[PDB]
Design a binder for this molecule. Structure first.
Ligand code: IHP
Lengths: 218, 84
């Protein structure tokens, strides 16, 4: 209902109409709206790129975000390329400029098919970026969403041992933001209940887990 | 005639679209060839087909950021096509 009033001649209008048509499995209309937004953005791109590249990065990020919608089509069409495009997404996100304002919209156009619980290697970096950029209240929300239960409500219950990277990042965030004493006991208990876990894990073939647990313990 | 070049470029782009991640052993020489046919164009050959097949072998192989430094003239020649 909101996108119906956005003008159709602007770049944002075509972009959002393409996203909406893609949400309801319309692979022919979405391609046309994408191709229209392409030139609607190319106008201002060539208008702004004549000065400097740092001036045109604001449109280059939008063009990159628009060129990632076809990969969403391939994700929703061919099941064999899902992990490969899910990996090239992480490989391509490491080249952009570390700013939360554009990372948010890139991850939002990216989470159209990948839930935060399916690729958390790219959301832990987002939480760390929000923490380093002074926006700790968004890093806390991201870490809570990745965990599944907000530990700031049950001050006595331990932290969920599942997803060890997420709880490690949460303890780091708790130490950094407010409390330097509770995070200490939390990390002690985490190290204890994580060292008491590798003993019962007699891995004979899957060797991609013991080394990661050892690095985390270090 | 450039018809053979356009034909082989189109078929090699279709092949790269067909077989993904099994062409990573070939993308380097393909890049060195297709950038020398795109940039420093001694003749007036078809640039759209070369551009399309170049963009087609980076969405299948996953060559995202490395060519930006392996070929430091790629971004400039990609931006010039908006003003030329
Ligand atoms: O910023 P720090 O608190 O010092 O933590 C850093 C940081 O990771 P986090 O910020 O996500 O915890 C590094 O990543 P960058 O943000 O600096 O790029 C990471 O190195 P990687 O890039 O390889 O992930 C490094 O880990 P390591 O100590 O193995 O170098 C890790 O340090 P800690 O996890 O020990 O705090």
């Amino acid at each position: 209902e909101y996108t119906c009033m956005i003008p159709r001649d602007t770049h944002d209008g075509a972009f959002y109409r393409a996203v909406l048509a893609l949400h309801q499995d319309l692979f022919s209309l979405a391609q046309q709206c994408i191709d229209k937004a392409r030139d609607l953005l190319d106008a201002e791109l060539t208008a702004m790129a004549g000065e400097s590249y740092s001036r045109a990065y604001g449109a280059m990020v939008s063009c990159h975000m628009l060129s990632e919608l076809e990969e969403v089509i391939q994700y929703k069409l061919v099941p064999e390329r899902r992990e490969i495009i899910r990996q090239i997404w992480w490989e391509r996100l490491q080249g952009c400029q570390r700013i939360v304002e554009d990372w948010q919209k890139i991850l939002m156009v990216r989470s159209l098919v990948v839930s935060p619980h399916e690729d958390m290697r790219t959301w832990l970096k987002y939480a760390s970026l929000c923490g380093k950029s002074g926006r700790l209240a968004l890093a806390h929300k991201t870490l809570v969403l990745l965990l599944g239960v907000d530990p700031s409500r049950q001050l006595d219950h331990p932290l969920p041992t599942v997803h060890p990277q997420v709880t490690y990042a949460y303890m780091k965030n708790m130490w950094k933001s407010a409390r330097k004493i509770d995070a200490f006991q939390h990390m002690q208990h985490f190290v204890q209940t994580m060292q008491q876990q590798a003993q019962h894990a007699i891995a004979t073939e899957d060797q991609q887990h013991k080394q990661e647990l050892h690095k985390l313990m270090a | 005639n450039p018809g053979v070049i356009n034909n082989v470029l189109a078929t090699i782009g279709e092949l790269a679209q067909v077989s993904g991640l099994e062409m990573r052993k070939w993308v380097d020489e393909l890049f060195i060839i297709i950038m020398d046919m795109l940039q420093d164009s001694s003749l007036l050959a078809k640039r759209q087909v070369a551009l399309w097949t170049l963009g087609q072998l980076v969405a299948s192989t996953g060559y995202v950021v490395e060519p930006y430094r392996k070929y430091p003239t790629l971004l400039e020649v990609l931006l010039n096509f908006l003003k030329t």
